[PDB]
Amino acid sequence: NTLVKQLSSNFGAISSVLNDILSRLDPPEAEVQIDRLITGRLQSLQTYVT
Amino acid sequence: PSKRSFIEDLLFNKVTLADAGFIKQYGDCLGDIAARDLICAQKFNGLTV
Amino acid sequence: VGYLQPRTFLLKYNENGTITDAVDCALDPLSETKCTLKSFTVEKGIYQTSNFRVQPTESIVRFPNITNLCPFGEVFNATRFASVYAWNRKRISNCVADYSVLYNSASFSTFKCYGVSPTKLNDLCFTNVYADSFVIRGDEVRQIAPGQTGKIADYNYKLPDDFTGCVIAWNSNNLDSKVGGNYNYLYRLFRKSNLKPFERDISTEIYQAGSTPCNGVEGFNCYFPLQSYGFQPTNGVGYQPYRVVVLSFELLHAPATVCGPKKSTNLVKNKCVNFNFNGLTGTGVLTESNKKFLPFQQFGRDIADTTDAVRDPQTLEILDITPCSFGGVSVITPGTNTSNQVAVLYQ
Amino acid sequence: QCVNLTTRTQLPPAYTNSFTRGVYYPDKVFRSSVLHSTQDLFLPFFSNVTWFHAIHVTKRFDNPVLPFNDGVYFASTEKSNIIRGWIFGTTLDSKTQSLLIVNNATNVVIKVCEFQFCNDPFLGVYYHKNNKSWMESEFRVYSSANNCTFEYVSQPFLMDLEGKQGNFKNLREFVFKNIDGYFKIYSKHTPINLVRDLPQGFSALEPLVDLPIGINITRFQTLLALHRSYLTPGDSSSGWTAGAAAYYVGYLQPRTFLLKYNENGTITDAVDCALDPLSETKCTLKSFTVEKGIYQTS
Amino acid sequence: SVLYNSASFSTFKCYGVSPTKLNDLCFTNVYADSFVIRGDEVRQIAPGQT
Ligand SMILES: *[C@@H]1O[C@H](CO)[C@@H](O[C@@H]2O[C@H](CO)[C@@H](O)[C@H](O)[C@H]2NC(C)=O)[C@H](O)[C@H]1NC(C)=O
Ligand SMILES: *[C@@H]1O[C@H](CO)[C@@H](O[C@@H]2O[C@H](CO)[C@@H](O)[C@H](O)[C@H]2NC(C)=O)[C@H](O)[C@H]1NC(C)=O
Ligand SMILES: *[C@@H]1O[C@H](CO)[C@@H](O[C@@H]2O[C@H](CO)[C@@H](O)[C@H](O)[C@H]2NC(C)=O)[C@H](O)[C@H]1NC(C)=O
Ligand SMILES: *[C@@H]1O[C@H](CO)[C@@H](O[C@@H]2O[C@H](CO)[C@@H](O)[C@H](O)[C@H]2NC(C)=O)[C@H](O)[C@H]1NC(C)=O
Ligand SMILES: *[C@@H]1O[C@H](CO)[C@@H](O[C@@H]2O[C@H](CO)[C@@H](O)[C@H](O)[C@H]2NC(C)=O)[C@H](O)[C@H]1NC(C)=O
Ligand SMILES: *[C@@H]1O[C@H](CO)[C@@H](O)[C@H](O)[C@H]1NC(C)=O
Ligand SMILES: *[C@@H]1O[C@H](CO)[C@@H](O)[C@H](O)[C@H]1NC(C)=O
Ligand SMILES: *[C@@H]1O[C@H](CO)[C@@H](O)[C@H](O)[C@H]1NC(C)=O
Ligand SMILES: *[C@@H]1O[C@H](CO)[C@@H](O)[C@H](O)[C@H]1NC(C)=O
Ligand SMILES: *[C@@H]1O[C@H](CO)[C@@H](O)[C@H](O)[C@H]1NC(C)=O
């Protein structure tokens, strides 16, 4: 349940919702926000597995 | 039905598993039931038991 | 003749550099385990592959019923603009934002958008739209931006640090220059403190530069705060007049009414479909909902913060949204060395 | 014309306690069956609010000019529509711009102009004995209003205006904020049956309006109404009774709250996370129930 | 602010500091460099230019 709850973190991005970012932003500017979210969520999975 | 002793039956009723059974169908939680029941919220995000 | 699709392949290079074999990673679960193990040989066992995935069939768009065009003609083509100190603010609502009608009559030297990409404007719906209008000197146009200094950005007009909207500016020497000199436009030069964002100060009190109070007499070190621009046809480009419009709005949180040009389709239910609701795009299955929204809200969000309910902008009915990819899969193989026959378990 | 009211007894100010009052919906997203934390400008729990009367018996027609620090929680216990509106501004003397929100007998009027407000603004209701009827006679708020930037007038209605005799029957709660040129108003109306003291309970306020005024508010003043009849003999400055009413003022601070949403989407409970260490452990555990033990707080 | 009522600058850009913080800072080893160029070449007065 903690893994499910940690999906609402921005990790320093404009929003935590991918669909919100993908609309209102074009690919070159959406890529940096998506990259921040990807790094944060990989870290959450790593902590869980350890 | 279960060939369990009396004491084993008493012991098995004192620990409550999070989910009984491993077949939760897609049609079982469609719409409101999703995101309310915790198992379906887990399963819509790739987390399986 | 055959037709190509976007796929992932696992290619094999021998010791001479030629591709001698390949695996199509999405043909079979067996091929998927080959792709994951990064080998062409699989040993006997049971492997987890991937959750069962469903691809969408249709695409739907649902925008509100709007017929009128936005007032581009009394915003960008007004006969008289305001002074920068007493700048003008106008509400905009209930209109289609088809801005290509400006192409054949208007040319803008400056057009910059904050918080949104200019290529997405055609697919969005806008909340609480306002237009601010004034006239400034050309040199000062660089000051209409967040986090700027200078007399315009300190005493006359201030933008927030977190600003969503667009700034548009064009040269208007033909309209606002008079051969004698145009002194209708004014600006503030002296102020005790800087302005707050979106604040308007229109007072005319004698400014006290030093000690020895003025008693509103305008003496030595006691000034009249407002001063006039001198606009003449023969000025340098830096000193020529510029007309400025600032558009301010909000996106994807509350019910909207402007909603740029895009045609709506029919509502289809109980199928996985790409969807666009008031500019918010996604994929999933739409079902009837028992939730009751209060009149001021448009979207519903769950614990993970993703949107799971939406009010329909046409029929005003609440709909639930569900993902269409669910369920675990496993593959049982006796070994690729022995055979290619496999079994599949759907959990 | 402006008239300075006389014959009003001066009394020391009174204070009371706010029992988990002043909660509003922070945003416009529907949520259900969830505990949600949010940081915003709230009225702290169990605070110390100021109390003002309009009780004839002393007269005590209170209408002071009050500060507007970071936003105001305003509560009103009424039975006869005495509290009629507010004026917000900095100097209130036609050198600066001010905001008027008034409810006259027929319309709701919101104006942003350069007003020369009266020193003692009020509204006047007159009562006729020969035919029993209460009608609005006086509007003594400002002398002149010159440069008006924003104006709004509502659709016509008829208000009651009749003087009542029972105990207080209506609680009206408002929250006022001023951020980035927007004046934000939240409100809620509630039926009550009490005589004194702001009551207990919980009720979240809903968004009401968001005005783009763009002015520098620093102070504010409440607009009340008067009753005149044949039993109020005198000139303008002395022939007036009061009519019972009470109002309470508190000031908002930036706080973190833990709000509770039931299965219908309404906020039914809240925790002020910085009141007590116990509340802080409630906030950390994200629950309203704490089991027996020892907890590290901060 | 004594420059406001007599001078107008077409270009003013600050590196390593925000223009809104200039009023609250103290400055070490201040130098001013002066020259005259053609208008087209103004874009070249910036780090990493050719
Ligand atoms: C809003 O108005 C207030 C009141 O006029 C301003 O605050 C005063 O500022 C002067 C000097 O600028 C001080 O001497 C006073 O002590 C201040 N009064 C208070 C109550 O703080 C305030 O500066 C104005 N806001 C802006 C952005 O100019
Ligand atoms: C009500 O009383 C106030 C005083 O509190 C009067 O206001 C004064 O008016 C005189 C004459 O115009 C001025 O010299 C003072 O400076 C004012 N005082 C303040 C504090 O503003 C007001 O005139 C009275 N109302 C009347 C007489 O109708
Ligand atoms: C609520 O606030 C008032 C005003 O600050 C408090 O009244 C003060 O109380 C202290 C201690 O009793 C006195 O020394 C002050 O003189 C009081 N001030 C005034 C203006 O009377 C009051 O104590 C606070 N708490 C409650 C419960 O009313
Ligand atoms: C309450 O205020 C409104 C707004 O000022 C008043 O309505 C105006 O009344 C004048 C006088 O007849 C008209 O000329 C305006 O056209 C009205 N404005 C409207 C209708 O929008 C209203 O009369 C006031 N009511 C009372 C009882 O004073
Ligand atoms: C605020 O009001 C003042 C006073 O009415 C305005 O100043 C006058 O405006 C008229 C209208 O053109 C002029 O004829 C006068 O010469 C102005 N000055 C004086 C001393 O009367 C002022 O323009 C208004 N402010 C705004 C922003 O409209
Ligand atoms: C690779 O090149 C060598 C040398 O030319 C050749 O003998 C061999 O047959 C080629 N192919 C493979 C698979 O090694
Ligand atoms: C703007 O107004 C002028 C005034 O007649 C008109 O000639 C011109 O065509 C207008 N441009 C538009 C509406 O784009
Ligand atoms: C919009 O259109 C739909 C269908 O065309 C209609 O049912 C509805 O009443 C219209 N108006 C609103 C406000 O939804
Ligand atoms: C009777 O009532 C009407 C309206 O309520 C009022 O205008 C009138 O003045 C009243 N009669 C007298 C004598 O005042
Ligand atoms: C919620 O809504 C239902 C249906 O309208 C109602 O029966 C119930 O009393 C409401 N309140 C709670 C706390 O469930």
- Cα gap E11→C140, rounded to integer Å: 10
Per-residue DSSP letters for chain D? -------------EEEEESS---B--SS-B--SEEEEEEEEEPPTTEEEEEEEE----------EEE-SS-EEEEEEESS----EEEEESS-SSSS-EEEEEE-SS-EEEEEE-EEEEEEEEEEEEEETTTTEEEEEEEEEEEEE----EEEEPPP---------SSEEEEEEEEEEEETTEEEEEEEEEEEEESSS-------BEEEEEEE------EEEEE-EEEE-TTS-S-TTT--B---EEEEEEE-EEEEEEEEE-TTS-EEEEEETTS-HHHHHHHHHTSS---SS-----
Taking CA C239 as the corner, what is the angle to CA C238 and CA C241, rounded to the nearest 5 degrees? 105
CB atoms within 10 A of CB C57: 10
Strand order across the beta sheet in which D267-272 lies: D34-42, D253-261, D267-272
**How many A from CA of D141 to the centre of ligand 2?**
15
Contact (CB<8Å) C137/E8? yes
E neighbour chains, 3+ CB pairs within 8 Å: C
Is it the case that chain C and chain D have 3 or more CB pairs lying under 8 Å apart? yes
Q: What are phi and psi of D36, to 5 degrees?
A: -130, 130
Strand partners, C92: C129
DSSP A13: S
- Cα gap D37→D273, rounded to integer Å: 9
**Residues D43, D230 contacting (CB under 8 angstroms):** no
Report chain A's terminal Cα–Cα distance, integer Å.
Answer: 16
- Cα gap C29→C342, rounded to integer Å: 9
Token digits for C49? 């592959």
Token digits for C112? 């910059």
Ligand nearest the Cα of residue C154 is 1
- Cα gap D150→D99, rounded to integer Å: 9
If DSSP codes are grouped into helix, strand and coil, which group holds residue A28? helix
Determine contact: A23 vs chain C, CB below 8 A.
yes
Q: What are phi and psi of C201, to 5 degrees?
A: -110, 115
The C-alpha R_g of chain E, in whole angstroms, comes to 14
Element (H, E) at A44: helix A27-49
Of B21, B24, B15, nearest in space to B43 by CA: B24
Specify the experimental method.
cryo-EM
**How many A from CA of D52 to the centre of ligand 1?**
28
* Letter string b/e over residues D205-236, b meaning 16 or more CB atoms within 10 A of that residue's CB: bebeeebbbbbbbeebbbbbbbbbbeeeeeee
- Cα gap C112→C166, rounded to integer Å: 5
3-state secondary structure string across chain C? CCCCCCCCEEEEECCCCCEEEEEECCCCHHHHHHHHHCCCCCCCEEEECCCCCCCCCEEEEECCCCCCECCCCCCCCCCCCCECCCCEEEEECCCECCHHHHCCCCCCCEEEEECCCHHHHHHCCEEEEEEEEEEEEHHHHHHCCCCCCCHHHHHHCCCCCCCCEEEEEEECHHHHCCCCCECCCEEECCCCCCCCCCCCCCCCCCEECCCCCCCCCCCCCEECCEEECCECCCCCHHHCEEEEEEEEEEECCCCCCCCCCCCCCCCCCCCCEEEEECCEEEEEEEEECCCCCCCCCCEEECCCCCEEEEECCCCCCEEEEECCCCCCEEEEECCCCCCCCCEEEEC
DSSP A25: S
Q: Look at chain E and count its residues.
A: 50
Resolution of the solved structure (Å): 2.9
**Residues D93, D144 contacting (CB under 8 angstroms):** no
Of E31, D74, A19, nearest in space to C306 by CA: A19
By most ligand atoms within 8 Å of CB, the mutation choice from D125, D127, D129, D133 for ligand 9 is D133
Strand partners, D123: D139, D225
If DSSP codes are grouped into helix, strand and coil, which group holds residue A50? coil
Q: Max Cα separation, chain B?
A: 42
By most ligand atoms within 8 Å of CB, the mutation choice from C74, C77, C175 for ligand 7 is C77
- Cα gap D184→D195, rounded to integer Å: 31
**Residues D225, D125 contacting (CB under 8 angstroms):** yes
CB atoms within 10 A of CB B7: 8
Q: Which amino acid is at A47?
A: T
**Residues D72, D18 contacting (CB under 8 angstroms):** no
Residue of D nearest to C292 (CA): D264
Q: Is C94 in the pocket of ligand 8 (CB under 6 A)?
A: no
Contact (CB<8Å) A3/B47? yes
Of D261, C308, D259, nearest in space to B41 by CA: C308
- At which residue do the structure tokens 């508010």 appear? D217
CB atoms within 10 A of CB D76: 19
- At which residue do the structure tokens 């548009």 appear? C168
- Cα gap C16→C331, rounded to integer Å: 35
Token digits for C200? 């308007």
Contact (CB<8Å) C281/A22? yes
- Cα gap D60→D50, rounded to integer Å: 15
Beta carbon pairs, A and B, within 8 Å: 10
> Which chain C residues are Cβ-neighbours of A24 within 8 angstroms?
115-117, 120, 124, 251-252, 279
Q: Is C314 in the pocket of ligand 8 (CB under 6 A)?
A: yes
By most ligand atoms within 8 Å of CB, the mutation choice from C105, C107, C108, C174 for ligand 7 is C105
- At which residue do the structure tokens 């917000």 appear? D88
Strand partners, C134: C244
Contact (CB<8Å) B47/A1? no
- Cα gap D238→D236, rounded to integer Å: 6
- Cα gap C331→C48, rounded to integer Å: 7
Beta carbon pairs, C and D, within 8 Å: 61
Determine contact: C213 vs chain E, CB below 8 A.
no
- At which residue do the structure tokens 């029929």 appear? C315
- Cα gap C252→C248, rounded to integer Å: 14
The residue whose CA has the least distance to atom 25 of ligand 5 is D147
**How many A from CA of D266 to the centre of ligand 10?**
10
DSSP B27: T
**How many A from CA of C77 to the centre of ligand 7?**
7
